[PDB]
Coordinates of C-alpha atoms and ligand atoms in Angstrom, one line a residue:
Chain A
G1395 CA -27.8 -3.5 59.0
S1396 CA -26.9 -3.7 55.3
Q1397 CA -24.2 -6.4 54.9
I1398 CA -24.4 -10.2 54.7
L1399 CA -21.6 -11.9 56.7
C1400 CA -20.2 -15.4 55.7
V1401 CA -18.2 -17.1 58.4
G1402 CA -16.1 -20.1 57.2
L1403 CA -13.2 -21.1 54.9
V1404 CA -11.1 -19.6 52.1
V1405 CA -9.0 -22.1 50.0
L1406 CA -6.8 -21.7 46.9
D1407 CA -8.3 -24.0 44.2
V1408 CA -5.6 -25.1 41.9
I1409 CA -8.0 -26.3 39.1
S1410 CA -7.2 -28.6 36.0
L1411 CA -9.8 -29.2 33.3
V1412 CA -9.8 -32.7 31.8
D1413 CA -11.9 -34.3 29.0
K1414 CA -12.1 -37.6 30.9
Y1415 CA -11.2 -38.3 34.6
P1416 CA -7.8 -40.0 34.9
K1417 CA -7.5 -43.8 35.7
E1418 CA -5.2 -44.6 38.7
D1419 CA -1.5 -44.7 37.6
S1420 CA -2.2 -42.9 34.2
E1421 CA -0.8 -39.6 32.7
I1422 CA -3.6 -37.5 31.2
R1423 CA -2.7 -34.0 29.8
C1424 CA -5.2 -31.3 30.9
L1425 CA -7.2 -28.9 28.6
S1426 CA -6.6 -25.8 30.8
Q1427 CA -5.4 -24.7 34.3
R1428 CA -6.7 -21.9 36.6
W1429 CA -6.4 -20.5 40.1
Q1430 CA -9.7 -19.8 41.6
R1431 CA -10.5 -18.6 45.2
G1432 CA -12.5 -21.3 47.0
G1433 CA -14.0 -22.6 50.3
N1434 CA -17.8 -22.6 51.1
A1435 CA -18.1 -19.3 52.9
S1436 CA -15.7 -17.8 50.4
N1437 CA -17.7 -19.0 47.3
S1438 CA -21.0 -17.8 48.8
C1439 CA -19.3 -14.3 49.1
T1440 CA -18.4 -14.3 45.4
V1441 CA -22.1 -15.1 44.5
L1442 CA -23.6 -12.5 46.9
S1443 CA -21.3 -9.8 45.4
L1444 CA -22.4 -10.8 41.9
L1445 CA -26.0 -10.8 42.9
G1446 CA -25.6 -7.1 44.1
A1447 CA -25.4 -7.7 47.8
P1448 CA -23.0 -5.9 50.1
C1449 CA -21.1 -8.7 51.8
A1450 CA -18.2 -9.5 54.2
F1451 CA -16.1 -12.6 54.8
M1452 CA -14.8 -13.9 58.1
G1453 CA -12.2 -16.7 58.1
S1454 CA -8.7 -17.6 59.0
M1455 CA -5.8 -16.6 56.8
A1456 CA -2.0 -16.6 57.1
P1457 CA 0.2 -13.7 55.9
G1458 CA 1.9 -14.6 52.6
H1459 CA 1.7 -14.8 48.8
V1460 CA -1.3 -17.3 48.7
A1461 CA -3.3 -14.8 51.1
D1462 CA -2.3 -11.9 48.8
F1463 CA -3.8 -13.7 45.7
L1464 CA -7.0 -14.5 47.8
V1465 CA -7.3 -11.0 49.2
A1466 CA -6.9 -9.4 45.8
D1467 CA -9.7 -11.7 44.5
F1468 CA -11.9 -10.9 47.5
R1469 CA -11.2 -7.1 46.9
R1470 CA -11.7 -7.3 43.1
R1471 CA -15.2 -8.6 43.9
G1472 CA -15.9 -6.0 46.6
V1473 CA -15.9 -8.5 49.5
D1474 CA -15.2 -6.9 52.9
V1475 CA -12.1 -8.6 54.1
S1476 CA -11.9 -6.4 57.3
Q1477 CA -13.2 -9.2 59.5
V1478 CA -10.4 -11.8 58.6
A1479 CA -8.7 -13.5 61.5
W1480 CA -5.0 -13.4 60.6
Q1481 CA -2.9 -16.2 62.1
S1482 CA 0.7 -15.9 63.1
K1483 CA 1.2 -19.8 63.0
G1484 CA 0.2 -21.9 60.0
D1485 CA -0.3 -21.7 56.2
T1486 CA -3.3 -20.9 53.9
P1487 CA -5.1 -24.1 52.7
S1488 CA -5.1 -25.0 49.0
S1489 CA -6.5 -27.9 47.0
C1490 CA -6.0 -29.7 43.7
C1491 CA -9.4 -29.7 41.8
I1492 CA -10.0 -31.9 38.8
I1493 CA -12.9 -30.7 36.7
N1494 CA -14.2 -33.2 34.1
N1495 CA -15.4 -31.2 31.0
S1496 CA -17.6 -34.1 29.7
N1497 CA -19.9 -34.0 32.8
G1498 CA -18.8 -31.1 35.0
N1499 CA -17.8 -33.3 37.9
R1500 CA -15.4 -31.8 40.4
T1501 CA -12.9 -34.0 42.3
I1502 CA -11.1 -32.2 45.2
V1503 CA -7.8 -33.3 47.0
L1504 CA -7.8 -30.8 49.9
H1505 CA -4.7 -29.8 52.0
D1506 CA -5.9 -28.7 55.4
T1507 CA -2.9 -26.8 56.8
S1508 CA -4.2 -27.1 60.4
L1509 CA -4.6 -23.2 60.4
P1510 CA -6.5 -22.5 63.7
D1511 CA -10.2 -22.0 63.0
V1512 CA -12.1 -18.8 63.8
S1513 CA -12.7 -18.7 67.6
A1514 CA -15.7 -17.4 69.6
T1515 CA -13.2 -14.8 70.9
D1516 CA -12.4 -13.6 67.3
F1517 CA -16.2 -13.3 66.8
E1518 CA -17.0 -11.4 70.1
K1519 CA -14.7 -8.7 68.6
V1520 CA -17.1 -8.1 65.7
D1521 CA -19.7 -5.2 65.8
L1522 CA -22.8 -6.9 64.5
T1523 CA -24.8 -3.7 63.8
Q1524 CA -23.6 -3.6 60.1
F1525 CA -25.0 -7.1 59.3
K1526 CA -28.6 -7.9 58.0
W1527 CA -27.8 -11.6 57.9
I1528 CA -25.0 -13.9 59.3
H1529 CA -24.3 -17.3 57.6
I1530 CA -22.0 -19.8 59.4
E1531 CA -20.4 -22.8 57.6
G1532 CA -20.3 -25.7 60.1
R1533 CA -16.6 -26.4 61.1
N1534 CA -15.7 -26.0 64.8
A1535 CA -19.2 -26.7 66.2
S1536 CA -18.4 -26.1 70.0
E1537 CA -16.9 -22.6 69.2
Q1538 CA -19.6 -21.6 66.5
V1539 CA -22.4 -22.4 69.0
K1540 CA -21.0 -19.7 71.3
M1541 CA -21.0 -17.3 68.2
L1542 CA -24.7 -18.2 67.5
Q1543 CA -25.6 -17.6 71.1
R1544 CA -24.0 -14.1 70.8
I1545 CA -26.2 -13.2 67.9
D1546 CA -29.2 -14.7 69.8
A1547 CA -28.3 -12.4 72.8
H1548 CA -28.0 -9.4 70.4
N1549 CA -31.4 -10.0 68.8
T1550 CA -33.3 -10.4 72.2
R1551 CA -32.4 -6.6 72.7
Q1552 CA -33.6 -5.7 69.2
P1553 CA -37.0 -4.7 67.7
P1554 CA -38.3 -7.2 65.1
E1555 CA -37.4 -4.6 62.4
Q1556 CA -33.6 -4.7 63.2
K1557 CA -33.2 -8.5 64.1
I1558 CA -30.1 -10.2 62.4
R1559 CA -31.2 -13.2 60.3
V1560 CA -29.1 -16.4 60.7
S1561 CA -28.4 -19.3 58.4
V1562 CA -26.2 -22.4 59.1
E1563 CA -24.7 -25.0 56.8
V1564 CA -24.1 -28.7 57.8
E1565 CA -22.1 -30.1 54.8
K1566 CA -19.7 -32.6 56.3
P1567 CA -21.1 -35.8 58.0
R1568 CA -19.4 -35.0 61.3
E1569 CA -21.4 -35.9 64.5
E1570 CA -20.1 -32.7 66.3
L1571 CA -21.8 -30.5 63.6
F1572 CA -25.2 -32.0 64.2
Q1573 CA -25.7 -29.8 67.3
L1574 CA -25.9 -26.8 64.9
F1575 CA -29.3 -28.0 63.6
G1576 CA -30.1 -26.4 66.4
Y1577 CA -29.5 -22.7 65.7
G1578 CA -30.4 -20.3 62.9
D1579 CA -33.6 -19.3 61.0
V1580 CA -32.5 -21.2 57.9
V1581 CA -30.6 -24.6 58.2
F1582 CA -29.0 -26.0 55.1
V1583 CA -28.4 -29.8 55.2
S1584 CA -26.4 -31.5 52.4
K1585 CA -27.3 -34.6 50.3
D1586 CA -24.0 -36.2 51.6
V1587 CA -25.0 -35.5 55.3
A1588 CA -28.6 -36.8 54.6
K1589 CA -27.5 -40.0 52.8
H1590 CA -25.0 -40.6 55.7
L1591 CA -27.9 -40.4 58.2
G1592 CA -29.8 -43.1 56.1
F1593 CA -32.1 -40.8 54.0
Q1594 CA -32.6 -41.5 50.3
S1595 CA -34.4 -38.3 49.2
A1596 CA -34.6 -34.6 50.3
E1597 CA -38.2 -35.2 51.4
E1598 CA -37.1 -38.2 53.7
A1599 CA -34.3 -36.0 55.1
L1600 CA -36.5 -32.9 55.8
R1601 CA -39.2 -35.1 57.5
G1602 CA -36.6 -37.0 59.5
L1603 CA -34.4 -34.0 60.7
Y1604 CA -37.1 -31.2 61.2
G1605 CA -37.4 -32.1 64.9
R1606 CA -33.7 -31.1 65.3
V1607 CA -34.2 -27.4 64.3
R1608 CA -35.2 -24.4 66.5
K1609 CA -38.9 -23.3 66.7
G1610 CA -40.0 -21.7 63.4
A1611 CA -36.7 -22.4 61.5
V1612 CA -36.7 -23.5 57.8
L1613 CA -34.7 -26.7 57.0
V1614 CA -33.4 -26.8 53.4
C1615 CA -31.9 -29.7 51.4
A1616 CA -30.6 -29.5 47.8
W1617 CA -30.4 -32.9 46.1
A1618 CA -28.3 -31.9 43.1
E1619 CA -30.1 -32.5 39.7
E1620 CA -33.2 -33.7 41.5
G1621 CA -33.8 -30.1 42.7
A1622 CA -34.2 -28.8 46.2
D1623 CA -36.7 -29.0 49.1
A1624 CA -37.5 -26.9 52.1
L1625 CA -39.7 -27.5 55.2
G1626 CA -41.0 -24.7 57.4
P1627 CA -43.0 -24.6 60.7
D1628 CA -46.3 -25.0 58.7
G1629 CA -45.4 -28.6 58.0
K1630 CA -45.7 -28.0 54.2
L1631 CA -43.0 -29.4 52.1
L1632 CA -41.8 -27.1 49.3
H1633 CA -40.0 -28.2 46.1
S1634 CA -38.1 -26.7 43.1
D1635 CA -36.9 -28.6 40.1
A1636 CA -33.3 -28.0 39.1
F1637 CA -32.5 -25.7 36.1
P1638 CA -29.9 -28.0 34.4
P1639 CA -27.8 -26.4 31.7
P1640 CA -27.9 -28.2 28.3
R1641 CA -24.1 -29.0 28.9
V1642 CA -22.9 -29.2 32.5
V1643 CA -19.2 -28.0 32.4
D1644 CA -18.2 -27.0 36.1
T1645 CA -20.1 -28.0 39.2
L1646 CA -17.4 -26.7 41.6
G1647 CA -19.3 -24.3 43.9
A1648 CA -22.8 -25.1 42.7
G1649 CA -24.1 -25.9 46.3
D1650 CA -22.4 -22.6 47.5
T1651 CA -24.2 -20.8 44.6
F1652 CA -27.5 -22.4 45.8
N1653 CA -26.9 -21.4 49.5
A1654 CA -26.0 -17.7 48.6
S1655 CA -28.9 -17.4 46.2
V1656 CA -31.4 -18.8 48.7
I1657 CA -29.9 -16.4 51.4
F1658 CA -30.1 -13.5 48.9
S1659 CA -33.7 -14.1 47.9
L1660 CA -34.9 -14.5 51.6
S1661 CA -32.9 -11.3 52.6
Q1662 CA -34.9 -9.5 49.9
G1663 CA -38.2 -10.6 51.5
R1664 CA -39.1 -13.3 48.9
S1665 CA -41.0 -16.5 50.0
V1666 CA -39.2 -19.7 50.8
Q1667 CA -40.8 -21.1 47.6
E1668 CA -39.4 -18.2 45.5
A1669 CA -36.0 -18.6 47.2
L1670 CA -35.8 -22.4 46.6
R1671 CA -36.6 -21.8 42.9
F1672 CA -34.0 -18.9 42.6
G1673 CA -31.3 -21.0 44.4
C1674 CA -31.8 -23.8 41.8
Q1675 CA -31.9 -21.2 39.0
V1676 CA -28.5 -19.7 39.8
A1677 CA -26.9 -23.0 40.8
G1678 CA -27.9 -24.4 37.4
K1679 CA -26.7 -21.4 35.4
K1680 CA -23.3 -21.7 37.1
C1681 CA -23.1 -25.4 36.2
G1682 CA -22.9 -24.5 32.4
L1683 CA -20.1 -22.0 33.1
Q1684 CA -16.5 -22.2 34.2
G1685 CA -16.2 -20.4 37.5
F1686 CA -18.6 -17.7 38.8
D1687 CA -18.4 -15.0 36.1
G1688 CA -21.5 -14.8 34.0
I1689 CA -24.0 -16.3 36.6
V1690 CA -25.9 -13.0 36.2
Chain B
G512 CA 23.8 -6.9 36.7
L513 CA 27.4 -7.6 35.2
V514 CA 28.2 -11.3 34.6
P515 CA 31.9 -11.9 33.8
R516 CA 32.7 -13.3 30.3
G517 CA 32.5 -17.1 29.7
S518 CA 31.5 -17.7 33.3
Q519 CA 27.9 -19.2 33.2
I520 CA 26.3 -22.5 32.4
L521 CA 23.1 -22.0 30.4
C522 CA 20.2 -24.6 30.7
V523 CA 17.5 -24.2 28.0
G524 CA 14.2 -26.1 28.5
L525 CA 11.2 -26.5 30.8
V526 CA 10.2 -25.1 34.2
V527 CA 6.8 -26.3 35.7
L528 CA 4.9 -26.0 39.1
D529 CA 4.4 -29.5 40.3
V530 CA 1.7 -29.9 42.9
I531 CA 2.3 -33.2 44.7
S532 CA -0.4 -34.6 47.1
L533 CA -0.1 -37.8 49.2
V534 CA -3.3 -39.7 49.7
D535 CA -4.2 -42.9 51.7
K536 CA -6.6 -44.0 49.0
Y537 CA -7.0 -42.7 45.4
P538 CA -10.1 -40.4 45.1
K539 CA -13.2 -41.6 43.2
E540 CA -14.6 -39.0 40.7
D541 CA -16.7 -36.2 42.4
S542 CA -15.3 -36.9 46.0
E543 CA -14.1 -34.1 48.3
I544 CA -11.2 -36.1 50.1
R545 CA -8.3 -34.7 52.3
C546 CA -4.6 -35.4 51.6
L547 CA -1.9 -36.6 54.1
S548 CA 0.7 -34.1 52.8
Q549 CA 0.9 -31.6 49.9
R550 CA 4.1 -30.1 48.4
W551 CA 4.6 -27.4 45.6
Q552 CA 7.9 -27.9 43.7
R553 CA 9.7 -26.4 40.8
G554 CA 10.2 -29.2 38.3
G555 CA 11.4 -29.5 34.6
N556 CA 14.6 -31.0 33.3
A557 CA 16.6 -27.8 32.4
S558 CA 15.1 -26.3 35.7
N559 CA 16.3 -29.2 37.9
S560 CA 19.8 -29.2 36.3
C561 CA 20.0 -25.5 37.2
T562 CA 19.3 -26.2 40.9
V563 CA 22.1 -28.9 40.9
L564 CA 24.7 -26.6 39.1
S565 CA 24.1 -23.8 41.7
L566 CA 24.5 -26.3 44.6
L567 CA 27.7 -27.6 42.9
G568 CA 29.1 -24.1 42.9
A569 CA 28.5 -23.1 39.3
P570 CA 27.3 -19.7 38.1
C571 CA 24.2 -20.8 36.1
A572 CA 21.3 -19.3 34.1
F573 CA 17.9 -20.7 33.0
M574 CA 16.2 -20.1 29.6
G575 CA 12.6 -21.2 29.2
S576 CA 9.1 -19.8 28.6
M577 CA 7.0 -18.3 31.4
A578 CA 3.8 -16.2 31.4
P579 CA 3.4 -13.3 33.9
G580 CA 1.4 -14.4 36.9
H581 CA 1.2 -16.1 40.3
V582 CA 2.6 -19.5 39.1
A583 CA 5.7 -17.7 37.5
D584 CA 6.2 -15.7 40.7
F585 CA 6.4 -19.0 42.7
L586 CA 8.9 -20.5 40.2
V587 CA 11.0 -17.3 40.0
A588 CA 11.2 -17.0 43.8
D589 CA 12.4 -20.7 43.9
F590 CA 15.0 -20.1 41.1
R591 CA 16.2 -17.2 43.1
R592 CA 16.2 -19.3 46.3
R593 CA 18.6 -21.7 44.5
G594 CA 20.5 -18.7 43.1
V595 CA 19.7 -19.3 39.4
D596 CA 20.0 -16.3 37.0
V597 CA 16.6 -15.9 35.4
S598 CA 17.4 -12.9 33.1
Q599 CA 17.2 -15.0 30.0
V600 CA 13.5 -16.2 30.5
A601 CA 11.3 -15.8 27.4
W602 CA 8.2 -14.1 28.9
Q603 CA 5.0 -15.0 26.9
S604 CA 1.9 -12.7 26.3
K605 CA -0.3 -15.7 25.6
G606 CA -0.5 -19.1 27.4
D607 CA -0.3 -20.8 30.9
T608 CA 3.0 -21.2 32.8
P609 CA 3.1 -25.0 33.1
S610 CA 1.6 -26.6 36.2
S611 CA 1.3 -30.5 36.8
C612 CA -0.7 -32.2 39.5
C613 CA 0.6 -35.5 40.9
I614 CA -1.4 -37.8 43.2
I615 CA 0.7 -40.4 45.2
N616 CA -1.2 -43.2 46.8
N617 CA 0.5 -44.2 50.1
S618 CA -1.3 -47.6 50.2
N619 CA 0.4 -48.8 46.9
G620 CA 3.0 -46.0 46.0
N621 CA 1.4 -45.5 42.5
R622 CA 1.7 -42.1 40.9
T623 CA -1.2 -40.4 38.9
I624 CA -0.2 -37.3 36.8
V625 CA -2.3 -34.6 35.3
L626 CA 0.2 -33.0 32.9
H627 CA 0.3 -29.3 32.1
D628 CA -1.5 -28.0 29.0
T629 CA 0.3 -27.2 25.7
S630 CA -0.8 -23.5 25.6
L631 CA 2.6 -21.9 26.3
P632 CA 4.8 -21.4 23.2
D633 CA 8.3 -23.1 23.6
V634 CA 11.5 -20.9 23.3
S635 CA 11.9 -19.9 19.6
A636 CA 15.2 -19.6 17.5
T637 CA 14.4 -15.8 17.2
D638 CA 14.1 -15.6 21.0
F639 CA 17.6 -17.3 21.2
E640 CA 19.0 -15.1 18.4
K641 CA 18.6 -12.1 20.9
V642 CA 21.0 -13.7 23.6
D643 CA 24.6 -12.5 23.9
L644 CA 26.5 -15.8 24.2
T645 CA 29.8 -14.3 25.6
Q646 CA 28.8 -14.9 29.3
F647 CA 28.4 -18.6 28.8
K648 CA 31.1 -21.2 28.9
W649 CA 28.7 -24.1 28.3
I650 CA 25.1 -24.3 26.8
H651 CA 22.8 -27.3 27.6
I652 CA 19.6 -27.8 25.6
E653 CA 16.7 -30.1 26.7
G654 CA 15.2 -31.6 23.5
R655 CA 11.7 -30.2 23.1
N656 CA 11.0 -28.2 19.8
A657 CA 13.7 -29.9 17.7
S658 CA 13.3 -27.9 14.5
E659 CA 13.7 -24.5 16.4
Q660 CA 16.5 -25.8 18.7
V661 CA 18.6 -27.0 15.7
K662 CA 18.7 -23.3 14.5
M663 CA 19.8 -22.4 18.1
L664 CA 22.6 -25.1 18.0
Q665 CA 23.7 -23.8 14.5
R666 CA 23.9 -20.2 16.0
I667 CA 26.4 -21.5 18.7
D668 CA 28.3 -23.4 16.0
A669 CA 28.6 -20.1 14.0
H670 CA 29.7 -18.2 17.1
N671 CA 32.4 -20.8 17.9
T672 CA 33.9 -20.8 14.3
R673 CA 35.1 -17.2 14.8
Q674 CA 36.4 -18.0 18.5
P675 CA 39.9 -19.1 19.6
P676 CA 39.8 -22.7 21.2
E677 CA 40.0 -21.2 24.7
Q678 CA 36.8 -19.1 24.1
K679 CA 34.7 -21.9 22.5
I680 CA 31.3 -22.5 24.1
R681 CA 30.8 -26.2 25.0
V682 CA 27.4 -27.7 24.1
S683 CA 25.4 -30.6 25.5
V684 CA 22.0 -31.9 24.4
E685 CA 19.4 -34.1 26.1
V686 CA 17.0 -36.6 24.3
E687 CA 14.7 -37.8 27.1
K688 CA 11.3 -38.2 25.4
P689 CA 10.9 -41.0 22.7
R690 CA 9.7 -38.7 19.9
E691 CA 11.1 -39.0 16.3
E692 CA 11.3 -35.1 16.0
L693 CA 14.0 -35.1 18.7
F694 CA 16.3 -37.8 17.2
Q695 CA 17.8 -35.2 14.8
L696 CA 19.4 -33.5 17.9
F697 CA 21.8 -36.5 18.1
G698 CA 23.8 -34.7 15.4
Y699 CA 24.5 -31.5 17.6
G700 CA 26.6 -30.9 20.7
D701 CA 29.9 -32.0 22.2
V702 CA 28.0 -34.2 24.8
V703 CA 24.8 -36.0 23.9
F704 CA 22.7 -37.5 26.8
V705 CA 20.3 -40.3 25.7
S706 CA 17.8 -41.7 28.2
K707 CA 17.0 -45.3 29.3
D708 CA 13.4 -44.7 28.2
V709 CA 14.5 -43.4 24.7
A710 CA 17.0 -46.3 24.4
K711 CA 14.5 -49.0 25.3
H712 CA 11.9 -47.4 22.9
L713 CA 14.5 -47.8 20.0
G714 CA 14.9 -51.5 21.0
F715 CA 18.1 -51.4 23.1
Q716 CA 18.2 -53.5 26.3
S717 CA 21.4 -52.0 27.8
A718 CA 23.4 -48.7 27.9
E719 CA 26.2 -50.6 26.0
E720 CA 23.7 -51.7 23.2
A721 CA 22.4 -48.1 23.0
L722 CA 25.8 -46.4 22.8
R723 CA 27.1 -48.8 20.1
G724 CA 23.8 -48.5 18.2
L725 CA 23.4 -44.7 18.3
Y726 CA 27.0 -43.4 18.1
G727 CA 26.8 -43.1 14.3
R728 CA 24.1 -40.5 14.8
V729 CA 26.4 -38.0 16.6
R730 CA 28.7 -35.3 15.1
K731 CA 32.5 -35.9 14.7
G732 CA 34.3 -36.1 18.1
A733 CA 31.1 -35.9 20.3
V734 CA 30.6 -38.0 23.4
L735 CA 27.3 -40.1 23.7
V736 CA 26.2 -40.7 27.4
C737 CA 23.6 -43.1 28.8
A738 CA 22.6 -43.6 32.4
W739 CA 20.8 -46.8 33.1
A740 CA 19.5 -46.2 36.6
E741 CA 20.9 -48.6 39.3
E742 CA 22.9 -50.3 36.5
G743 CA 25.2 -47.2 36.4
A744 CA 26.1 -45.1 33.4
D745 CA 28.1 -45.4 30.2
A746 CA 29.8 -43.0 27.8
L747 CA 31.3 -43.5 24.3
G748 CA 33.7 -41.1 22.7
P749 CA 35.5 -40.8 19.3
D750 CA 38.2 -43.3 20.5
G751 CA 35.6 -46.1 20.3
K752 CA 36.3 -47.0 24.0
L753 CA 33.2 -47.7 26.0
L754 CA 33.5 -46.1 29.5
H755 CA 31.4 -47.3 32.5
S756 CA 30.6 -46.3 36.1
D757 CA 28.7 -48.3 38.6
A758 CA 25.9 -46.5 40.5
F759 CA 26.5 -45.3 44.1
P760 CA 23.1 -46.5 45.6
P761 CA 22.1 -44.8 48.9
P762 CA 21.7 -46.9 52.2
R763 CA 17.9 -46.3 51.7
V764 CA 16.2 -44.8 48.6
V765 CA 14.0 -41.8 49.5
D766 CA 13.4 -39.8 46.3
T767 CA 14.5 -40.6 42.7
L768 CA 12.6 -37.6 41.2
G769 CA 15.3 -35.5 39.4
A770 CA 18.2 -38.1 39.7
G771 CA 18.7 -38.1 35.9
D772 CA 18.8 -34.3 36.0
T773 CA 21.3 -34.5 38.9
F774 CA 23.4 -36.9 36.7
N775 CA 23.3 -34.6 33.7
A776 CA 24.2 -31.4 35.6
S777 CA 27.1 -33.3 37.5
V778 CA 28.5 -34.7 34.3
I779 CA 28.3 -31.2 32.6
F780 CA 29.9 -29.7 35.7
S781 CA 32.9 -32.1 35.9
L782 CA 33.6 -31.7 32.1
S783 CA 33.3 -27.9 32.4
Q784 CA 36.0 -28.1 35.2
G785 CA 38.3 -30.0 32.7
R786 CA 37.9 -33.5 34.2
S787 CA 38.1 -36.6 32.0
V788 CA 34.9 -38.3 30.6
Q789 CA 35.6 -41.2 33.0
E790 CA 36.0 -38.9 36.0
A791 CA 32.7 -37.1 35.0
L792 CA 30.7 -40.4 34.6
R793 CA 31.8 -41.4 38.1
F794 CA 31.0 -37.9 39.6
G795 CA 27.6 -37.9 37.8
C796 CA 26.8 -41.4 39.4
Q797 CA 28.1 -40.3 42.9
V798 CA 25.9 -37.1 43.0
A799 CA 22.8 -38.8 41.4
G800 CA 23.2 -41.6 44.1
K801 CA 23.5 -39.2 47.0
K802 CA 20.4 -37.4 45.8
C803 CA 18.4 -40.6 45.8
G804 CA 18.7 -41.0 49.6
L805 CA 17.5 -37.4 50.1
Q806 CA 14.1 -35.6 49.8
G807 CA 14.7 -32.9 47.1
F808 CA 18.1 -31.3 46.3
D809 CA 19.0 -29.8 49.8
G810 CA 22.0 -31.9 50.9
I811 CA 23.5 -33.3 47.6
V812 CA 26.9 -31.6 48.5
Ligands
RZA526 C1 -27.6 -27.0 44.3 C2 -28.5 -27.9 43.6 C3 -30.0 -27.6 43.7 O1 -30.7 -28.8 44.0 C4 -30.0 -27.5 42.1 N1 -28.6 -27.7 42.1 C5 -27.7 -28.4 41.2 N2 -26.7 -29.1 41.8 C6 -25.9 -29.8 41.0 N3 -24.9 -30.5 41.7 C7 -23.7 -31.1 41.0 C8 -22.7 -31.1 42.2 O2 -21.6 -32.0 42.0 C9 -23.5 -31.4 43.4 O3 -23.8 -32.8 43.5 C10 -24.8 -30.6 43.1 C11 -26.1 -29.8 39.6 C12 -27.1 -29.1 39.1 C13 -27.4 -29.4 37.6 F1 -28.3 -30.3 37.4 F2 -27.9 -28.3 37.0 F3 -26.3 -29.7 36.9 C14 -28.0 -28.3 39.8 C15 -29.0 -27.5 39.2 N4 -29.8 -26.8 38.8
RZA527 C1 21.0 -41.4 36.8 C2 21.5 -42.8 37.3 C3 23.0 -43.1 37.1 O1 23.1 -44.4 36.4 C4 23.1 -43.2 38.6 N1 21.7 -43.0 38.7 C5 20.7 -43.6 39.5 N2 19.4 -43.6 39.1 C6 18.4 -44.2 39.8 N3 17.2 -44.1 39.2 C7 16.0 -44.9 39.6 C8 14.8 -44.1 39.1 O2 14.0 -44.8 38.2 C9 15.5 -42.8 38.5 O3 14.7 -42.4 37.4 C10 16.9 -43.3 38.0 C11 18.7 -44.8 41.0 C12 20.0 -44.8 41.5 C13 20.2 -45.5 42.8 F1 20.5 -46.8 42.7 F2 21.1 -45.0 43.6 F3 19.1 -45.5 43.6 C14 21.1 -44.2 40.8 C15 22.4 -44.2 41.4 N4 23.4 -44.1 41.8

């Protein structure tokens, strides 16, 4: 296997750049506008391609002009779109993103079209042999657990040399998703999910949630500008300071940059410490740039 | 393709992609919230007046700036969907096709707007100088870049001086934004539309006060028109006789977005058809009122 598969969402980000965030009932005029392809699994694909990794995307899309824009962007990047689960019923999701130029803060108003999510049936149809690593963005937990069990089954039949590495992301504080803790060799838990569970630091979260992971898995938690932490089976907490840019201009997709960079580094055989550090390095570079161009 | 001579109604002005999201509570900065419902709409005054003229049964054309891209493709497809001739569009090499983002809170009804950037150049007088006016029976200009538009208005004046009265192009002008640059446009056109917002900003408290106060600013024999929402509309012509029409409010008000544009297009339509200013004021008020009980422009006729 050579490719890195990212299973999750693709969203059209209808971005506006403002000098100051608007006050409810106001009329600000934006600096600039752009269409950017978004969604967590989608943004991680952009980053992996830029990092020089052969990657593929798996997500639901509806035939139409929004899909044509997204597909052309995926293709322009060299993202393998051959795994896309095309839906006959529904529309492709989009969102209004407000990026504050004075601090880089991103405010998203998402429109979730109720496009059916990728099923365990869609996933059974995939020939796993081309993949080196499979990353799943937590969405439809019950259906994704069946996908994770399929990869587990594949791997039991494989020599250690050709075992598919698996990562999982729990970004939304949804009780259903917490069963995914659970599966995978690398588990990414968000600051928002951690705070929701009552943890006030990435060290508190990793010590509190490590009991929920599979034997020998690595639990990772990025805490924005405070840097990121990781905890493996050795019980040794690992840390990396952030690499903040002198001027933070766009934080939209920073966490996705972190996830893809950590996945990349580990796929390349680097240590968890090296990977934590690289993840923050790339996430920080991206924060001082508009979009993903120039992160390398 | 072939458009018969003196058949179309031209609307010069703005087209924009409005992205309207309905939220239960306004988002706090850095949040990743999910909206109730999200609509993409083709907005802009000259743009909305085109939709209405097509629905009224009028062959119409739009003239405005657009840049090649995916926003333009959405807008062009909508123009076409409402059967608007888009052959006059001034395509720009530099700039963004306008897009505005509206956030409507469902718990209080308050609208938060993030207005399009200023990057796209407006239609120039040299752009207009390239249009063959013979296919138009009427030309309506939305006040934007006043200095340039005055040269466009003078071009139509020049065209008309060498035309017989039956082949004269009728001209209307809209002053909707309260900016001093635009107030020079009162001096052009056969029909001048002044807004309630512009009127109030000049210190007028009624459409009667505005028409009596601003009539001196119009050219000889022009008609000054002012719609005052639910209070109805007024018109004042060279005879010095103030004309009025009550509003025709719908049983329930659904959507007032583009009501003024519906009024303008309906008044232009009626006059283009040879009806009296009184008949046209009334028609403008009827159509604008029908639209208010409707979501969008779909069933206004
Ligand atoms: C992915 C995490 C690793 O923990 C380092 N990363 C960063 N995340 C930031 N976020 C702002 C977004 O709104 C999210 O809250 C996360 C900002 C920065 C920076 F400080 F540079 F601006 C860095 C970095 N480096
Ligand atoms: C254009 C003017 C003519 O005066 C008739 N029109 C109406 N405008 C309304 N507006 C309320 C919002 O603020 C819009 O901006 C304007 C509402 C109504 C109605 F009462 F029906 F709802 C009517 C009518 N008829």
